[PDB]
């Protein structure tokens, strides 16, 4: 509670760490392969919780 | 509105939804009615159709 | 024999799901049971582009099925044997025609993706029914969409060559058996590209094959009569190219001509016998 | 619907052949209609003629097929292929083809050598060679490769500077498969009916070359002028003389409809010429016992 984010290149809404792993920007991705950060950056399951 | 030198006769068809009275005499036809057959078509595990 | 297949839905459903199965009871869907892979719902997922050749080769890979009933959790449907005849309705978002056509086609809906895709928010299965349409209607709409996307990509390259009004006067209006229908608008892009490379490889391949088979029958009536017709502008430039690039051209040429010949053949080829207008149904067997 | 069709022999099938015939149970065999000759493929593929793979393909496509189920001594039974029935076929063929995707299976003559699908019958003066079963796309590329060799052996021989005859024998080479490459048998002379098939194909090719759609020429010229697509890699950023000289004219809407209409009917005719030989649509192939359940497509 004394800082905002440890890194700002993945925590904001349009960050590099977001656009690598969000569901809205993987619309040209290969659907088969697995990515572990999809359990963190994905908008639907972050909002499912 | 000058009348030209030729006369015309319009032809149009008018489709009419009518009602028809049907008659028959006494003992016109002879209905040979047989006993119906039953065949289980769908042998479903929820409800069976015959 | 019960040809019926049972599928259990995952969760509970609601009202307009019943309304949209009552809309789509008559129309049909392919097969792989497993509630995810029921039909074309693994190709129309938007994380990949909905392509035509992958969906078409899947549709020719799997069998077909008639949806029959949807209860609170069950999906009662029967599949297609080549043996006995089943009853088919239209129930399609284009409502085209059945005037006694003895040959049918089953193609994925090029007129609308969302026109045949039915969606449920509780169940993400996004199932979809490929458009059943008669064979002259099928060939006319596939021509009038393939040449349309060819013209669209050519205008995107150079707009000064092709226009839109004179092509919407003709290539947007299919007309078959007195009925004049209207249609206008990735998958057709790549399908056109396969045809684009096949029709540009067909000249060199054609002159190479007629130069190989030109003097087999040393005085033939038929061979000379097929040699007298084609283009004098075409048969010059063959011997300049190396061997391996030539045979790679012919190999890719043969693969995609076999692919596009089987693709221009209408895939799942149904056949109807007697169509009832007042019930909007016909009897069909697989052919 | 009868299936149990016995084929009566005339001599004693000895125990050196009973073992390898019981080894080949669940395979596919073509029928004549039995008599001891004409039941198989050795009646049309003998050692005296060239292996042409078209006349034997014609015998496979003209007459029906049959599953081998039991081989007794002095007689063996066969089970026909009537449509509407689900036939279970084991993969008992020496060039193995794994049916992962379970596509439409497809009959073929033994183009991968006579020696793997032959059986030596010394009871009667007859040899029986088994047809090859494999999925559809491998079968179609085998067809295109054997016709390409049958048309190109003669024209590589026809050059006076034949410094490379062996170029096509490795360029064509094996069949194109990921897990393993499988070399095949290559005949020098295509024979009569192979040349008749190439003659009909040349008929169709020169008829469809009279109508080319000019619209795709503009698109491929643009894709040359744009970035080099990986499907364009066969051109290596080159405009040949023919595509440069068929584009002096304009692009309209008049020719394109009749062009694509006759291309529809001629490509459907070419599919009918490439719907060649009886095929088997496959559903529910169980890999753990290697049985592909098929009905006659």
Curated annotation (Swiss-Prot), chain A:
Compartments where found: Virion; Host nucleus
Range of residues in the leader sequence: none
Top-level lineage group: Viruses
Subunit structure: Homomultimer. Makes the hexons and eleven out of twelve pentons. Interacts with triplex proteins 1/TRX1 and 2/TRX2; adjacent capsomers are linked together in groups of three by triplexes, heterotrimeric complexes composed of one molecule of TRX1 and two molecules of TRX2. Interacts with scaffold protein; this interaction allows efficient MCP transport to the host nucleus. Interacts with capsid vertex component 2/CVC2. Interacts with the small capsomere-interacting protein/SCP.
Function, as annotated: Self-assembles to form an icosahedral capsid with a T=16 symmetry, about 200 nm in diameter, and consisting of 150 hexons and 12 pentons (total of 162 capsomers). Hexons form the edges and faces of the capsid and are each composed of six MCP molecules. In contrast, one penton is found at each of the 12 vertices. Eleven of the pentons are MCP pentamers, while the last vertex is occupied by the portal complex.
Family that this chain belongs to: Belongs to the herpesviridae major capsid protein family.
Protein name per its UniProtKB record: Major capsid protein
Source organism (scientific name): Epstein-Barr virus (strain B95-8)
Name of the coding gene: MCP
Residues included from the entire protein: 1235 to 1283 of 1381
Curated annotation (Swiss-Prot), chain D:
Location of this chain's protein in the cell: Virion; Host nucleus
InterPro entries: Herpes_capsid_2 (IPR002690)
Calcium recorded as keyword: no
GO CC, alphabetical: host cell nucleus; viral capsid
Organism: Epstein-Barr virus (strain B95-8)
Keywords: Capsid protein, Host nucleus, Virion
Domain of life the protein comes from: Viruses
Described purpose of this protein according to its UniProt entry: Structural component of the T=16 icosahedral capsid. The capsid is composed of pentamers and hexamers of major capsid protein/MCP, which are linked together by heterotrimers called triplexes. These triplexes are formed by a single molecule of triplex protein 1/TRX1 and two copies of triplex protein 2/TRX2. Additionally, TRX1 is required for efficient transport of TRX2 to the nucleus, which is the site of capsid assembly.
Protein name, UniProt field: Triplex capsid protein 2
């Amino acid at each position: 509670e004394y800082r905002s984010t440890v890194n700002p290149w993945a925590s904001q809404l349009g960050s590099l760490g977001d656009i690598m792993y969000n569901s809205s920007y993987r619309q040209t991705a290969v659907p088969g392969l697995y990515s572990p950060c999809r359990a963190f950056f994905n908008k639907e399951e972050l909002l499912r919780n | 509105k000058i009348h030209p030198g030729v006369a015309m006769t319009v032809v149009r068809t008018d489709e009419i939804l009518s009602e028809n009275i049907l008659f028959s005499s006494r003992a016109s036809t002879s209905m040979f009615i047989g006993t119906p057959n039953v065949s289980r078509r769908e042998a479903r595990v929820d409800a069976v159709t015959f | 024999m019960d040809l019926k297949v049972v599928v259990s839905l995952s969760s509970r459903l609601y009202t307009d799901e019943i309304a949209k199965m009552q809309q789509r009871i008559g129309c049909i869907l392919p097969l792989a049971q497993n509630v995810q892979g029921l039909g074309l719902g693994q190709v129309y997922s938007l994380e990949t582009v909905p392509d035509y050749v992958s969906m078409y080769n899947y549709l020719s890979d799997c069998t077909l099925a008639v949806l029959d009933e949807v209860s609170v959790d069950s999906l009662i449907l029967t599949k297609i044997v080549p043996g006995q005849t089943y009853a088919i309705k239209n129930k399609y978002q284009p409502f085209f025609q059945w005037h006694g056509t003895g040959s049918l086609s089953v193609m994925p809906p090029v007129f609308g993706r969302e026109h045949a895709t039915v969606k449920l928010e509780s169940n993400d299965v996004d199932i979809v029914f490929p458009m059943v349409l008669p064979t002259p209607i099928a060939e006319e709409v596939l021509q009038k969409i393939l040449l349309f996307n060819v013209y669209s990509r050519v205008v995107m390259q150079a707009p000064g060559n092709a226009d839109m009004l004179d092509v919407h006067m003709h290539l947007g209006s299919v007309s078959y058996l007195g009925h004049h229908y209207e249609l206008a608008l990735a998958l057709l892009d790549n399908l056109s590209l396969y045809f684009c490379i096949m029709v540009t490889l067909l000249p060199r391949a054609s002159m190479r094959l007629v130069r190989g088979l030109i003097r087999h029958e040393h005085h033939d009536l038929l061979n000379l009569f097929q040699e007298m017709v084609p283009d004098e502008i075409a048969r010059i430039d063959l011997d300049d190219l190396s061997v391996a690039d030539d045979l790679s051209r012919m190999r890719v040429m043969m693969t995609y001509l076999q692919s596009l010949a089987s693709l221009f053949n209408l895939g799942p080829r149904l056949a109807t016998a007697a169509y009832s207008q007042e019930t909007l149904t016909a009897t069909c067997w697989l052919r």
